[PDB]
């Protein structure tokens, strides 16, 4: 599982 | 910016 | 969040 | 497991 926010 | 890996 | 019950 | 990046 991988999440990213910019 | 925020990232997470499990 | 990244995760939970795994 | 219970958790991760929270």
Partners of residue D2 in chain B, C-beta under 8 Å: none
Alpha-carbon distance B1 to B6, whole Å? 17
- Whether chain B has a CB inside 8 Å of the CB on D2: the answer is no
Alpha-carbon distance B4 to C1, whole Å? 7
State this model's resolution in angstroms: 1.8
Partners of residue C2 in chain B, C-beta under 8 Å: 4-6
Q: How far is C6 from chain D (nearest CA, A)?
A: 5
DSSP A3: E
- Residue B5: is it exposed, middle or buried by C-beta count within 10 angstroms (0-12/13-18/19+)? exposed
Block residue for tokens 């910019």: A6
Alpha carbon separation from B3 to A1, A5, C4, D2 (Å, rounded): 11, 6, 16, 18
The CA R_g of chain A, rounded to the nearest whole Å, is 6
């Amino acid at each position: 599982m991988v999440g990213g926010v910019v």
